Copies of this chain bind each other. A is one copy, B any other.
Amino acid sequence: TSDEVRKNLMDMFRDRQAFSEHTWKMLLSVCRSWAAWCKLNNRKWFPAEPEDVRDYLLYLQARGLAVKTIQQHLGQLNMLHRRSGLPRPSDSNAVSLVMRRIRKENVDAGERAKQALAFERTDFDQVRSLMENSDRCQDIRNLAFLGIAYNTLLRAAEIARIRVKDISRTDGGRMLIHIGRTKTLVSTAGVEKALSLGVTKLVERWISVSGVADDPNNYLFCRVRKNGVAAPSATSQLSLSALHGIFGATHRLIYGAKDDSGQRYLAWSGHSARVGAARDMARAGVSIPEIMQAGGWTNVNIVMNYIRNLDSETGAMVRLLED
């Protein structure tokens, strides 16, 4: 079915906007890896043979990769074949059995899904107690950022996407922000966010120095060069990669040099403040709805994963036992 398959991949290329760029990136990434392994192991990479895919999955595990990562591989390989008319590796008894086995084997060696390191009020006040005083342009900007981040629980991409026009001024000069936190359709279109007398002051400065207010198609956050000189733009926002940096560079300021070699959530990442505001909100007995919403989350099983080591969430059994 070479002509069938040819037609299929042309279909795939013609309507490639059917998937997100990130999806294609991961697809490409898995194929390069699978292909490179087939080459090294003398195997045909396309179509993929059950037995070869199985050996690979084990090679992935022996590489000490996580279950969820091995899934992404299988997943990408399955889609490739499903999208080129060939049988999916998953629908093979040897790949179904081995994934199952590897899954069980890994969870039984302590495979732990990780999450972001909480950036809670305790850290906000702390970093605040360390920078509200500096005249450093990148220090005032970075303070605003973690101010917005923490206050609003907005996704990093949403903080970047922001523009000066998107900012209002409420009760006692408080601030508000017309946003958009939904990959649309049956959801919301936007949401509007408000600040506190605290982070409203922090941002004020950013505005004051950045001088960004000058061209309102401008974005609130912009790069700040080594001379401590900002650089507005209405056509370019700060890279997610940078926002992640403000978080990491900040953990370092307080905790210093990368830690316990090995990686993954060693410092605060872009989701830390959301993971942080959540617990705090839960720690003041707020509401899961007030929260779930407060962060735009739609299907709770995640928020809960965040507030799980908290005493509020201990469980009916501990309640009973402490009569």
Contacts and interface: CB of A to CB of B under 8 A. Distances in A.
B15 A98 contact: yes
Contact of A196 (B98, B191, B318): B318
Contacts of A287: 316
Given A101-B15, A107-B181, A314-B290, A93 B305 contact: no
Contact of A184 (B101, B110, B121): B110
Nearest to A82: B93
Contact of A104 (B186, B191, B310): B186
A176 interface: yes
A321 B199 contact: yes
Nearest to A289: B282
Interface stretch (A31-39, A165-173, A225-233, A256-264): A165-173
A116 to B, nearest CB: 14
Interface string A12-40: 10110111100000000000000000000
Given A93-B83, A308-B293, A314 B174 contact: yes
A286 interface: yes
A176 B284 contact: no
Interface residues of A, number: 91
A317 B170 contact: no
B17 A105 contact: yes
Interface of A: 8, 11-12, 14-15, 17-20, 66-68, 83, 93-94, 96-98, 100-101, 103-108, 110-113, 121, 151-153, 161, 163, 165-166, 168, 170-172, 174, 176, 178, 180-181, 183-199, 277, 280-282, 284, 286-287, 289-291, 293-294, 298, 304-305, 308-311, 314-318, 320-322
- 3 A-B pairs closest in CB distance: A18-B101, A15-B97, A196-B321
